[PDB]
Every structure is written in structure tokens, then in C-alpha cells.
């Protein structure tokens, strides 16, 4: 009898998640039918969107999420035993799939690149950075780009794509270790927004003439400050607003419209899965090539043990992670 | 010659009041240049924001249609000029823009300050380039009985769009229903703005021409369709606002709907684009496609009252002061 | 007999403007038995009118008190020539059956303006008297913070505080008002509009903190004062004029952690709570203190009933030094 | 001897999470003469720890009180077996010289849990007692609004109000808490998280308004209650838990025009203001009311010192019905 472990939402989140909001459960998977495969999670991801999306779950439901898995049992010759796939059964160690909701990893994947990169730099967060910067911000080279949560999965890729396109990049991060990381990736200016005396003065010193593009992952009052330093016709890619995801009171004041209008800002939000097919596969091939060419470096914040997946999720929300947060099954 | 000028005596706290202004009389020097007599002056919301950058004693800023009274600018010529809130001014001849060569005698000269002027250009580029309507969309427009808003709704209608308009009085509702706006409501008297917008367009809104901002816009944003476009033209609900700025739109909604929100300034468009827009606006006015209405206040001495009344919704159409 | 009346043409949005008011003329009917005909001598304008006007319907007469003279009388208790306080609103003439009228103190001298019955020896003075002596409960030797301190209420609060043995810190909005309160003997006076830091000015004024806070202003000003209240300090919430003309949400409240740790008492009051013997005794004390020079008065007189809206609006904007009064 | 201690690993942002705390083991120092070794039997978690943690340095022990027993004694006043209240923080074992310890009431009976010395017959119960009987000044027949009414303080407030002859309206965060307080005899109880309109619900609960408001919550909730206070209504500002875990800006303050029109008295207090005979008398009254059944006790017991952070976070989020207690 094939068994699985599953993390469920015991209680809807109030502020930051805590341990008591999750419940680990064990169950037996049904026998494998023809055309189906048994998938064993190798790496699971935790992601900020899970904090926003959990409100649509019912208590008792499995937490949503993607994973890299390997076929351990196969009644499907297209997915033979040993095949590596991306699947989204949620926070579970094993699952059954008929193949229609799976994705194989890029065919040209070298043995030197961790499979877990398919959940990060050469995965959904890397595609978020890719399309957000190149199509929503529309950088053509030479722009000054501000990016926050810059040492995270999305932000670290944003800055490095911007650098290879010829941009100046200013990155905000929450720890001194993250400062060193991004200065090693080539960021032009990197500062710890939690320890600077004034965010406003720090951003002005980093780019006294303002910012052409703002890849916004944080929202809130941080973004109000950046908006006051956007150049005329500046573009904001509204990627996320993680300062608001765990919020317990009211949203903060909005960006002051008189500045937005006088600077004629263009602020567009996007979802990474707007792009599919040709587009998404081509972007993944670019990200992989750039990793193999050394133009995109990566770091992973790997937490060992499926039983520590809630801890990985809460740690990521608190800024513990340098790079993509991953859970090794 | 003599002149009268309105100056900022005290910086505005909330809405202006009469004591924040001061009328001063002075003696213009003899020409040694042209002398211009104000015929029609305009008051506009931007003056509330721009006055914060003035010093107490400076003349209020503003545009006017004036006539020469004393060779390329002979006596009797009509010109747009922006010497501020004043009845008479001296010009070197370079800061003046002449009305369209084909300005017919069938439309008031004051339209050069409204529908065939800066407000009409704001509605034109805001709707056609920023929102980018092509026909068939559902457009939400607030301050819809004002100078910009009423032109936005009429352009949207001649492009084949459904137009939902919000105004602050029942008289403005009646006027816009005669103009043919698909749905018009008084936002000050509806039981629930959210309910009214849902009934006006159960499908949602493709475009939002935003003149108001604030909490009104947070509600509209909750009913934008996916990939909806918001033209951030103004935020009049914040210009005179005491206290802290209102919350912004919920980011979860902006992101899930993948909204594009772009602000603009009418004077971005210069040269050929500006002139083509003015000639489209004038053609639509002569064809009847854009009806015009002006809120004319008689007397230069009532200019502060016209400005304050406009900020508070007294005006139906472009607020104009006849000197 | 004709009368002029100021009516509310449009409800206020932000500060009142001229267009919100409309002057109307009418003819009053003949007197019935028991009634009198009053001619306004002095009318008052007060901050409360900005708050209470929201209760009016457009067309209604603006509310307000006045010192009036009986010019025709079918009321034996109110013969021709009698001076009274009446509240018919902003009107030059009115008819009264007598029951809503108040005679001035029988001991009222001819050496002081009649208009003090609308100020220091009237409703504002009573507001200062009971707000300071009963709500704050000053007992002698305390440090008192009072804002709008050059106004009808504030200037009396500080002077009563002085003659009780208190130190008085006063906040005002102009240097002219600073000079006036320095003449009245305020220990510390400052212009809250020009100081670099309100917090630092209040710390320097009283390093020890404040025992009592007579609050006329509210808003952020009061949040700063509350951060410097001593333990068990008392706040008399008299007004909140910084909010009366507001167009958006109120500013944040006082930080509750400070209110609780300092165990503050914050009590609001309305002057008309006190009646009968208590009210009469207060009026006799105020009059006595004025005749003895212990309470000096200053009036901001505006001539002409036609300028009453302008007097109301100037007062709201802080142009008045002392009680604002309109001479009919 | 060894001890386990919970320390603040990281300052809280919003509500705490588990990784903000860190459990450390250490060897206690030897017992000097006059000292005792205390073993925790029951520890409390309280809302004030969220506010007070802001002033700790990372690495510091979390503050808090406990019921402890003397397990080793060099102090003849505190022999082995003695039960004491002590405040060494979140720790299983501690040393004391006896000066900071409080013995239980001489008349404490064996029929009630010792953990009531941390709740109803302890600091939360004294808070309710003095806040209602001295700050609100309940005299019988008033209508009292109390929020967090199913918590340690609030549940005692409502039951004292009932035995003093008052009508009690309580607000709580769950249907189970509504049902429990209805069982105790609260006149009206509602779930503030699920009602369509807080304003409408409060008006239905007491159409004539409220004489007294025991305020544990503050924020927007209190602004709504203040709009329904009767004239001369009294507010006991006990806490403001809606602000303790906030991240953005404080909410608007109460509308001063309503505060002034209704002439409200709003006084904050700290339970430790009352000492000596007054405190001992209140404790004896609370114990008598428990033994008589007029104050039914209810504890939300969490087993295991290792679960103390989760008990604290659960209490802050409304998990607790009654006083939150950790059984060592
Ligand atoms: N629209 C889309 O399709 C899409 C897809 C994926 C992700 N996203 C968004 O992209 C952003 C990053 O996602 P990710 O997967 O790359 O996560 P990540 O950056 O790897 O982890 C989240 C990071 O956010 C920072 N953070 C947390 N709370 C913060 C606060 N209050 N203020 C400022 N920074 C805070 C922390 O870094 P510091 O130490 O720098 O604070 C933390 O490490 C999120 O907003 C997410 O929702 C959007
Ligand atoms: N970006 C640009 O280039 C540009 C250029 C010109 C103007 N603008 C903007 O366009 C807008 C309209 O300008 P306009 O010249 O046509 O003025 P208008 O609409 O003719 O007059 C302003 C109108 O705004 C409304 N209003 C005032 N306060 C309001 C509030 N708190 N909430 C909602 N509506 C309120 C009133 O109408 P109701 O009775 O409907 O309230 C009033 O009649 C303003 O925001 C202005 O700044 C932008
Ligand atoms: N509770 C009662 O029974 C009662 C009775 C009467 C009056 N009151 C209150 O007492 C206060 C004083 O009334 P009053 O008759 O003596 O009027 P006043 O002080 O003679 O005139 C009002 C004054 O308030 C000041 N002010 C206006 N806006 C302000 C702002 N935003 N911030 C700070 N100060 C501001 C101005 O002086 P600066 O130049 O100093 O700004 C102005 O001179 C008012 O709040 C009124 O409602 C209460
Ligand atoms: N001044 C003093 O000397 C003193 C002494 C002790 C305590 N206090 C205060 O008294 C209050 C109660 O303390 P306690 O020990 O009895 O705690 P408690 O009520 O046992 O627990 C706190 C309760 O507050 C409620 N709550 C939490 N967040 C809330 C919010 N945002 N809005 C409304 N209710 C919320 C929750 O119950 P629901 O299910 O009702 O949400 C929770 O169960 C606190 O404010 C505390 O600071 C003051
Ligand atoms: Cl710029
Ligand atoms: Cl008792
Ligand atoms: Cl927990």
C-alpha cells in the first residue's frame, strides 16, 4: 500500500502563519490505473502566493503548491519510471497523475544544474522576473531599475537580467548577508532597507536622477517612497505586494496621485501564467542558457525534511531565505 | 493703463475660502509688445494643486482668451494667453497661441478654454491613447458632467462604447441622460456605490477614465475586467482633502485582474498630435457629435467664487468667467 | 418693522465661503400680548456654529446669541429699554414671548462694554470657568496647557489659572497673539505655526510635563500634548476646532499605550450643564474678576450686520484676538 | 538544577510567529541564604506581553507571572511546599530572595485551581473589579458594554456587572463564546466578526445607548461604541488590543463632536494603582464571588511549557475561552 503525507490548512491565517495553522496527515493512495503514474516529490516549493491563495481554501484542504517529482510507478509509457516532472498536487510527498497536468523538465537539462532550479530561476519565479522586466517594464537597455525583495527568487533574477541588458540596478534587501550576495551578482547599489536611517535618502543617493523602472514585489509604504523618485514616464511592474499579505489592519495610504500624474507613471500588474506555449518555453530556455553562461547565478535556501515545510513557508515570509526557498523531501 | 489681479493671500487649508484671495489694482507701464484685455478667463482644478507651489502675494495662475488693444499681433487679434488671474497684461508676443485658423463664428470663443481647448485635449488623449478605446468597450467616467468628463463620455459614445457616468447632482444626471450616456447616477445619493456600479455593468468595466481618485476609485477598481485600463487623469477628491491620503486599491485585485493604470498630462502631446486632436474636437463640435455646455460666471471680481464653486461641484460644463 | 436675517444657503464644505450665506429681508408682524420686539446691539459668532449648521436645512436662519434692546413691549417684566441676551439667530430684529430671554446681572456696571455678556462675562467665560475649575479640577500650583489661548475661551482659562497659582503654557497662531498673552502673564507662550518642533517647544516649556490640558483644538496637536502629560493628568475636552472644517477622516487618535500607562482622565463637557445657583455664582465671579483687573478682556469688533458672515469666517481662520463680536 | 526559558529571538512584526521565540536551557545558580528555588506549576500569557516585548532586547527572557511551588528553601518564611506568585518570566525554574513574591490569600480553599490566582482571583480579575467599580463607577441599573467579553478581564467585568444589577452587552469573536456568555447571563452577546454592521448590532443590543463602556479593544470598534454612549457616559480605557499587533497606522480617533455633545468621561487605568487594603479587599471579594458561584470560572488550559508561545499567539487571536493558562 502506497502511503503519502500531506500538509493541510487547519486554520485560516491571521497575520503571519504559525505552526498551529497546519496539520500533517497520512493516507493511502489508491492503486495505479492504466495511463497513470505515481510521483514521489524530490523538491517542493513554498511561495508568497500561497499566503494570498490560502483564503480560498476550506479548512482541512491540502495546501497548494508545485514540486519537482520523479515517477516511481508507471502505467504510462510516455512517463516511464525515473522521469522527472513538474506537478502541482500541493504539499504532499506522493501523488497520482494521469499525465495531463504534468510538465517534463527542459530536454537540454545538464546534470550539473540542480533539479530544484525548475522551481526557481529556471522556473515560475524566473519567468515572473523575465516577463515582468522585459515586457511590463519593457527595458531596452540603459534604464535605472529599482527592485525590492532583491535577494529573493524573483528579485535576484530581475536584477541579473537587467544587468545583462545593460541596466543600472538598485536592490533593496532585508539582511547584511543578502547585501553581499547581490553585490556578488553585479547589482550596482544594494542596501539593507531594515537598517538604513532613511529609505528616502538612501534611494536618492543610489540614483539621484530617479528611476526609470520599478519592479515592485513589496507594495505599501516602501512603494510610496520609490514612487516619489520615479522619473517622468517611469514604469512600475506590479509583481506583488508582500508587505500586505500578512497584514492585520488597513492598507496604508496609496501612492500620492499628484506625484503619479505629474510624473505620468505607467503602473501595470501581471501574472506570470499570462504567457504560455511558445512564450513560456522560450523564456525557460533563455533562463537556462543564461545560467549555464554564468550571466545568471543562483543560490538556494534549502530546508531538509517534508515535515519542515510549514517552517520553510513561514521563514520565507519572514525574510530568512537567501534565494529560492526549497524543501528537499 | 489699469489692471486688476487676483493674488494668493493665504495658502489653502482644505478648500479655499474668500479670505485666501486678495484683489489688487496696479498700473501697467506704457507699451515699450501688445496690451491684452481678458475676455474669458478659466478656472481649473489644477490651480488648487499648483497654488501650493506659490508664495503668498503671487498672482494666481490661469489661461484666458484675450484681445489686443494696443505687427504680427495687430489690434483686435484674439489669443490664448496665461498671464494669471488678471484683466490686463503686457506680452512680448511669444507666449501667445492663436486660436485655430478655421475658428468659425458659430461657436463661442470660450470653447478654446474648454472642449476645443486644454480640457477637451485631456479627454481626447486620455481616452483614445491612454485607455485606448477602439469601440465596444464599457467605460466608467466620473466627474462626468464636468469639462473633461462630459467630453470623455461623448467621444466614447461616437466610438460605439457604453458609457457609465458618475456626477454629484440630479441636475447633472438629467443633462448627461439628454447627452445619451448609457447609465448616469448621482454618487452622493446612491445607497451603495458598489451596487450601483454592478447594475450599471454586470460584465465589469474595460476602461476607467479617473478624474476623482480616492475611495471612489477603489470601488471601481474592484469591478474592472481582466486587462482593464485606467487612465489616471486627476484625483479631485484628494486636492482639498484634510488628513491622510485614502488607502490605495487592494493589490490582490490589481494583480489578479492584471490592470494597467497609466497617468498622463495633456501637455505631453505637442506639435502635430496636438493640432490634429484640436481639429478633431472642433470638427466633432461643428458636426454635433460633441455638444458643449459652459458654466459662465459674470465678473472678474467673482473669479475666486467661480474657482471654489467648481471645486465643490457647482458647475455643469466648463467653468468660465466672463471679464 | 423690518428685519434682516442671514440664512444658510448651502451646507458648509470645508471652510464656509460667502456663497454659503444669503441675506434676506422680511417684515415682522405686530406684537401680541406678552411679546417684545428686540433690536440687536451686539451679535456673536462662535466656532460651535460651524458644527451645528449641519443640523440646519438650507434656508434656515443661522443660529446665534446677541445682546438686544427691547424697543417695543407688551410684556410688563420687559419694559422698553431693557437689555437682554437672546438667541434668535443672525437677525437684526426679532419677536420673543420673553420666556427664552435672560436679563444681565443686576450688578452689571456701565463701565464695561455690553458685549462682554457674549464673552468673558458670558458663555465663553463660563466655558473656561467650569472647564478649568471643575473638569480639569485645578487646585493651585499645577502646570496647565491651553491652546487657542488668545481666544474667547482660552484667554480666560489662562487668566483664571494664573490667579489660582498655576503655571500656564499657551499656544496661539500669530505673533500678535503671543504678545497679547505675554501681557496677560502667561508663563510660556508660543506660535504653534512657526515653531520648528511642537514636541520640543512643549518639552522646553515644561520639562516636568503637564498636569492639566484645556483642549480647544484636538487633532494632532492634542496627540503631541498627550505624550507629555504627567501621570493621572487631566484633559478637559472643550472643543476640537482643528476638525470642525474637515473634509476627510480624522487624524489618528492619541497613542493608547501612553494614555493607559499615564492613566489619563479625559472628560468632555458642555457649558450649559451648569445652571441655577452654580451658573449665577460663576457669572458674578467673572464680573468681579474683570472689575478688579484680574481678568482683562479684548474684543475683535466688526461693524455692520452685513459683515457677520465675514466675521464668522475670519474667526474660524484665526483673525480674531479675543471674542469676535459684530456691532449691529 | 536546570531550567528552561523562552526568550524573544526576534521582535514581533504584527502577530508573533513561532520563529520569534527561542527555547534555551541553563543551569540555575546555587541557592544563597534567604533564597528559594521555585518550580512553575502554572504560567500565564497576557496581552501586555505583546506591548512590553517592544522594550526587550533580542535574547531576553519573555516577561510574565506564574504560580510556583518552593522546591528548595533557605528562607524560613517560604518553606518547601509553599505556593507563591512570582514573575521570573517564561521559565520552568527560578531563584528568588522572597522580596518579589506574593503568597496566596490565607483563606484560599482547596476546591478551586491554584491557576485562578493568575486570572479571576488575580491580576485580570482585579483589572475588571477596579475598572468597572471605580473607573466606570457602576452603581446598579446601568447598561455596560464590554468587549473581549469572553476573555479573562471581560468575562469577570460582565459577571460583576450582573451581580451589581446591570444590563450587560458583550462582544466576542466566535459563536462558541457567544453561547458561553449567554449561559452566564449576559443580556446581549454578539460575534463582532460576523455581524453585517457593528453599528446596527450595538443599537439593537441597547437602543437607548450605553452608560458604561469597559474598553479592552480600542480602535474602530471603540469609535462605533462611542457613537452610542449616553450623555455623561463613562469609558474605562483598560486596553486597546486591536492596536497591539498592528503594522500600518493607528486608526482615526473618536469623533470629538460626539464626545463633546455627550460629555463623555474617558479614563484609563492600570491595575497596580490599587494596593494595600483596597487590593486585598478586592481579591477577597473575587474569591467569595467564585465560591458563591456568582463568578463562574473558566480556564483555557494548554499543557506543556514547550507550547507557551503557541498559547500566547492563540490568546492574541481569540482561541481562548476564559483565562489562558499553561500547565507546566
Ligand atoms: N505576479 C506573479 O505572477 C508572481 C509570481 C511569483 C511571485 N510573485 C511575487 O513576487 C514577490 C517575490 O516572490 P518570491 O517567490 O521571489 O519570494 P522571495 O522574494 O524569495 O521571498 C519573499 C521575500 O520578501 C521579503 N519580504 C517579506 N515581507 C516583507 C515586507 N513586509 N517588506 C519587504 N520585504 C518583505 C523578504 O525578503 P527581505 O529580506 O528583502 O525582506 C522575503 O525573503 C512576491 O511579492 C510574490 O507574490 C508574483
Ligand atoms: N492630467 C491632465 O492633463 C489634466 C488636465 C486638466 C484636468 N485634469 C483633471 O481632470 C479633472 C476634471 O477637470 P475639469 O477641468 O473638467 O473640472 P470639472 O470636472 O469641470 O470640475 C470639477 C468637478 O469635480 C467634481 N468633484 C469635486 N470634488 C469631488 C470629490 N471629492 N469627489 C468627486 N467629484 C468631485 C465636481 O463634480 P461632481 O458634482 O460630479 O462632484 C466638480 O464639478 C480634475 O481631476 C483635473 O485635475 C487633468
Ligand atoms: N464645550 C463647550 O461648551 C464650548 C463652549 C464654547 C466654546 N467651545 C470651544 O472652545 C473653542 C474656542 O472657542 P471660542 O469661542 O473661544 O473661539 P476663539 O478661540 O475666540 O476662536 C477660534 C480660534 O481657534 C483657533 N483655530 C482655528 N482653527 C485652528 C486649527 N486648525 N488649529 C488650531 N487653532 C485653530 C484660532 O486661533 P489661533 O490663531 O490660536 O489658531 C481662532 O482664533 C472651540 O473649539 C469651541 O468649539 C466649547
Ligand atoms: N490596564 C490594565 O491594568 C490591564 C491589565 C490587564 C489587562 N488589560 C487589558 O485588558 C484586555 C484583556 O486582557 P486579558 O488578559 O483579559 O486577555 P483576553 O481577553 O483573555 O484575550 C484577549 C482577547 O482579545 C480579543 N481580541 C484580540 N484581538 C482583537 C481585536 N483586534 N479586536 C477585538 N478583540 C480582539 C480576543 O477575543 P475575541 O474572540 O473577543 O476576539 C482575545 O481572546 C487587553 O486589552 C489587556 O491589555 C489591562
Ligand atoms: Cl524626471
Ligand atoms: Cl463591592
Ligand atoms: Cl503556534
Q: Are residues D112 and D133 in the same domain?
A: no
Residue C280 covered by a domain: no
> Shortest CB distance from B15 goes to which of C14, C310, C313?
C14
CB of residue C127 inside a 6 A radius of ligand 3: yes
Residue A47 covered by a domain: yes
Q: Are residues D156 and D251 in the same domain?
A: yes
Considering only CB atoms, which chain A residues are within 8 Å of D17?
15-18, 314, 318
- Among B251, B249, D246, D314, smallest CA distance to A52 is for B251
Structural determination approach: X-ray
User: Which amino acid residue places its CA nearest to atom 29 of ligand 4?
Assistant: D242
The CATH number of residue B298's host domain is 3.90.180.10
Q: Rounded to whole angstroms, how far apart are CA atoms C37 and C21? A: 25
C156: β partners: none
Residue C289 covered by a domain: no
Considering only CB atoms, which chain C residues are within 8 Å of D271?
none
Q: Rounded to whole angstroms, how far apart are CA atoms A180 and A194? A: 15
Contact (CB<8Å) C252/D255: no
- Among C247, C238, C262, smallest CA distance to C146 is for C238
Give φ, ψ of C220 to 5 degrees: -70, -30
CB of residue C174 inside a 6 A radius of ligand 3: yes
- Among D268, D253, D233, smallest CA distance to C242 is for D253
Residue in D120, D126, D148, D222 to alter for ligand 4 test, most ligand atoms within 8 A of Cβ: D148
User: Which resolution in angstroms does this entry have?
Assistant: 2.0
- Among C255, C268, C283, C253, smallest CA distance to C135 is for C268
The cell numbers describing A260, all together, are 503619479
Residue D284 covered by a domain: no
Residue B5: CB partners within 8 Å, gap ≥ 6? B23, B24, B25, B26, B59, B84, B85, B86, B87
Residue B56: CB partners within 8 Å, gap ≥ 6? B8, B9, B10, B11
Question: What one-character DSSP code corresponds to residue D75?
Answer: -
C130, C200 contact by CB (below 8 A): no
For residues D183, D184, D185, D188, the Cα torsion angle rounded to the nearest 10 degrees is -70
Considering only CB atoms, which chain C residues are within 8 Å of D273?
263
Subunits next to A (3 or more Cβ pairs <8 Å) are B, D
Contact (CB<8Å) C250/D249: no
Assign 3-class secondary structure to chain C: CEEEEEEECCCCCCCCCHHHEEEEEEECCCCCCCCEEEEEEEEECCCHHHHHHHHCCCCCECCCCEEEEEEEECCCCCCCCCEEEECCCCECEEEECCCCCEECCCCCCCCCCHHHHHCCCCHHHHHHHHHHHHHHCCCCCCEEEECCCCCHHHHHHHHHHHHCCCEEEEEECCHHHHHHHHHHCCCEEEECCCCCCHHHHHHHHCCCCEEEEEECCCHHHHHHHHCCEEEEEEEEECCCHHHHCCCCCCCECCCHHHHHHCCCEEEECCHHHCCHHHHHHHHHHHHHHHHCCCCCCCEEEEECHHHHHHHHHHHHCCCCCCEEEEEC
CA of D163 to the centre of ligand 4 (A): 22
> Shortest CB distance from A249 goes to which of D18, D247, D313?
D247
Pairing of strands C102-103, C83-86: antiparallel
Neighbours of B108 (CB within 10 A): 17
A213 is in an annotated binding site: no
CB of residue B315 inside a 6 A radius of ligand 2: yes
CA of C207 to the centre of ligand 3 (A): 26
Considering only CB atoms, which chain D residues are within 8 Å of C243?
256-257
The cell numbers describing D310, all together, are 503557541
Q: Rounded to whole angstroms, how far apart are CA atoms D224 and D202? A: 9
Residue B279 covered by a domain: no
A98, A282 contact by CB (below 8 A): no
Considering only CB atoms, which chain B residues are within 8 Å of A231?
none
> Which secondary-structure segment (H or E) carries B153?
helix B147-158
Please enumerate residues of C whose Cβ is less than 8 A from a Cβ of D: 51, 218, 237-240, 243-244, 249-257, 259-270, 273
Q: Rounded to whole angstroms, how far apart are CA atoms D110 and D120? A: 16
D47, D217 contact by CB (below 8 A): no
Q: Rounded to whole angstroms, how far apart are CA atoms D17 and A14? A: 10
Number of domains composing chain C? 2
A166 is in an annotated binding site: no
Q: Are residues A163 and A248 in the same domain?
A: yes
Considering only CB atoms, which chain A residues are within 8 Å of D15?
14-16, 18, 248
Q: Shortest Cα distance from A100 to chain B (angstroms)?
A: 25
Chain breaks in chain B (C to N over 2.5 A) after: 32, 70
Domain of residue D233 covers: 123-271
For residues B294, B297, B298, B299, the Cα torsion angle rounded to the nearest 10 degrees is -130
Contact (CB<8Å) D266/C261: no
C188: β partners: C169
Q: Shortest Cα distance from C300 to chain B (angstroms)?
A: 17
Which residues are close to ligand 7, an ion, with C-beta < 5 A? A 18-20; D 310
CA of C46 to the centre of ligand 3 (A): 8
Q: Are residues B24 and B140 in the same domain?
A: no
Interface test with B, best of A56, A227, A254 (most B CBs within 10 A): A254
Residue A289 covered by a domain: no
D307, D100 contact by CB (below 8 A): no
Residue D289 covered by a domain: no
Q: Are residues D214 and D149 in the same domain?
A: yes
Q: Are residues A132 and A243 in the same domain?
A: yes
CA of C182 to the centre of ligand 3 (A): 19
CA of A242 to the centre of ligand 1 (A): 6
CA of C173, closest atom in ligand 3: 39
Give φ, ψ of B10 to 5 degrees: -135, 140
The cell numbers describing C235, all together, are 484633559
Q: Are residues A108 and A200 in the same domain?
A: no
Q: Rounded to whole angstroms, how far apart are CA atoms C28 and C112? A: 32
The cell numbers describing B254, all together, are 490589481
How many degrees, rounded to 5, is the angle at CA B235 between CA B229 and CA B239?
170
For residues C171, C175, C179, C184, the Cα torsion angle rounded to the nearest 10 degrees is -20
Which ligand is nearest the CA of A320, by number?
1
Neighbours of C27 (CB within 10 A): 8
> Shortest CB distance from B17 goes to which of C249, C251, C313?
C313
Q: Are residues C7 and C139 in the same domain?
A: no
The CATH number of residue C250's host domain is 3.40.50.720
Q: Are residues B108 and B131 in the same domain?
A: no
Residue C113: CB partners within 8 Å, gap ≥ 6? C297, C299
Residue C198 covered by a domain: yes
CA of C319 to the centre of ligand 3 (A): 11
Q: Are residues C148 and C255 in the same domain?
A: yes
Q: Are residues B127 and B248 in the same domain?
A: yes
Pairing of strands B318-322, D299-303: unpaired
D177 is in an annotated binding site: yes
A153 is in an annotated binding site: yes
Q: Rounded to whole angstroms, how far apart are CA atoms D44 and D302? A: 10
CA of D322, closest atom in ligand 4: 20
Domain final residue, candidates B227, B251, B266 = B266
Long-range residue pairs from B89-93, CB within 8 A, at least 24 positions apart, any chain: B89/B3, B89/B28, B89/B35, B89/B36, B89/B38, B90/B28, B90/B29, B90/B31, B90/B33, B90/B34, B90/B35, B90/B36, B91/B33, B91/B34, B91/B36, B92/B33, B93/B33, B93/B34
Q: Are residues D264 and D128 in the same domain?
A: yes
Give φ, ψ of C280 to 5 degrees: -65, -40
Amino acid at each position: 500500500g502506497s502511503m503519502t503525507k500531506t500538509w493541510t490548512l487547519k486554520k485560516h491565517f491571521v497575520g503571519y502563519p504559525t505552526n498551529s495553522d497546519f496539520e500533517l496527515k497520512t493516507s493511502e493512495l489508491p492503486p495505479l490505473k492504466n495511463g497513470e503514474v505515481l510521483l514521489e516529490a524530490l523538491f517542493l516549493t513554498v511561495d508568497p502566493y500561497m499566503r494570498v491563495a490560502a483564503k480560498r481554501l476550506k479548512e482541512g484542504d491540502t495546501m497548494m503548491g508545485q514540486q519537482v517529482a520523479k515517477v516511481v510507478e508507471s502505467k504510462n509509457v510516455a512517463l516511464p519510471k525515473g522521469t522527472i516532472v513538474l506537478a502541482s498536487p500541493g504539499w504532499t510527498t506522493h501523488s497520482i497523475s494521469d499525465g495531463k497536468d504534468l510538465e517534463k523538465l527542459l530536454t537540454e537539462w545538464p546534470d550539473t544544474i540542480p533539479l530544484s532550479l525548475a522551481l526557481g530561476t529556471v522556473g515560475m519565479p524566473g519567468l515572473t522576473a523575465y516577463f515582468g522586466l522585459l515586457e511590463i517594464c519593457g527595458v531596452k537597455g540603459g534604464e535605472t531599475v529599482m527592485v525590492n525583495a532583491a535577494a529573493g527568487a524573483v528579485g535576484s533574477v530581475v536584477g541579473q537580467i537587467a544587468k545583462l541588458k545593460g541596466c543600472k540596478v538598485v536592490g533593496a534587501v532585508g539582511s547584511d548577508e543578502k547585501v553581499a550576495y547581490l553585490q556578488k551578482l553585479g547589482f550596482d547599489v544594494v542596501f539593507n532597507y531594515k537598517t538604513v536611517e532613511s529609505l528616502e535618502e538612501t534611494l536618492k543617493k543610489a540614483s539621484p536622477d530617479g528611476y526609470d523602472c520599478y519592479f515592485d514585489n513589496v507594495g505599501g509604504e516602501f512603494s510610496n517612497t520609490v514612487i516619489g523618485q520615479m522619473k517622468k514616464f517611469g514604469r512600475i511592474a506590479i509583481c506583488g505586494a508582500i508587505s500586505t499579505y500578512n497584514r492585520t489592519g488597513p492598507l496604508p495610504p496609496g501612492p500620492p496621485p499628484e506625484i503619479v500624474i505629474y510624473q505620468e507613471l505607467r503602473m501595470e500588474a501581471f501574472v506570470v501564467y499570462r504567457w504560455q506555449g511558445d512564450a513560456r518555453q522560450k523564456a525557460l530556455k533563455d533562463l537556462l542558457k543564461w545560467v549555464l553562461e554564468g550571466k545568471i547565478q543562483y543560490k538556494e535556501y534549502i530546508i531538509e525534511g517534508f515535515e519542515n515545510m510549514p517552517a520553510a513557508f513561514m521563514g520565507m515570509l519572514k525574510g530568512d531565505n537567501l534565494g529560492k526557498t526549497i524543501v528537499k523531501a
